[PDB]
Amino acid sequence: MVNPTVFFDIAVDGEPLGRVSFELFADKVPKTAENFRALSTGEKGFGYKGSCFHRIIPGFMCQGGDFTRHNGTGGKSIYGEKFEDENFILKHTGPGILSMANAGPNTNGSQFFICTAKTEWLDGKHVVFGKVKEGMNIVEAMERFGSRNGKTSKKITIADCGQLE
Ligand SMILES: Nc1cccnc1Cl
């Protein structure tokens, strides 16, 4: 009934930075939200702990969740290698939106991105499934390690992650 909350404990070259928490919109996109929740707890035997934000573009997004190839070519969902676009009810309205990365229609895996700007050209193409709850300051700090081309100047990792409540 209550949308779940998950956290990421972020590190910068192995040094702790802070916590980002997310509300997952299970009420609107249950299949998508459940995939991110399970990858955040690791309860399927795989997920986000230890992975990297491999592409960070200030004034756009921070992207991660490639736990199999570490660079934006990999990842897998709890349902199989890929799963369908569940719906496009939610839009990319501003900083803090959490949305699925993809490589075409119906190719969702594990990769996701946190918006740091409104990205409305992504509406109807990427599935929105959550938002930052606490720690947008930590996202902003992450964002400073990115670059125009997305290569980070320090390694930004999810040192720990799981479900709150
Ligand atoms: N394989 C895949 C999945 C999600 C986003 N981008 C890619 Cl290339």
Side-chain angles (χ1 to χ4, degrees), residues 63 72-74 101-103 107 109 111:
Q63 184 166 333
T73 67
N102 70 50
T107 61
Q111 288 188 65

Side-chain angles (χ1 to χ4, degrees), residues 5 86 149:
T5 300
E86 180 171 7
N149 69 31

Side-chain angles (χ1 to χ4, degrees), residues 25-34 86-87 90 127-130:
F25 300 137
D27 53 347
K28 307 283 173 60
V29 272
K31 186 172 182 169
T32 310
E34 172 62 13
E86 180 171 7
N87 64 60
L90 298 170
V127 177
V128 174
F129 68 92

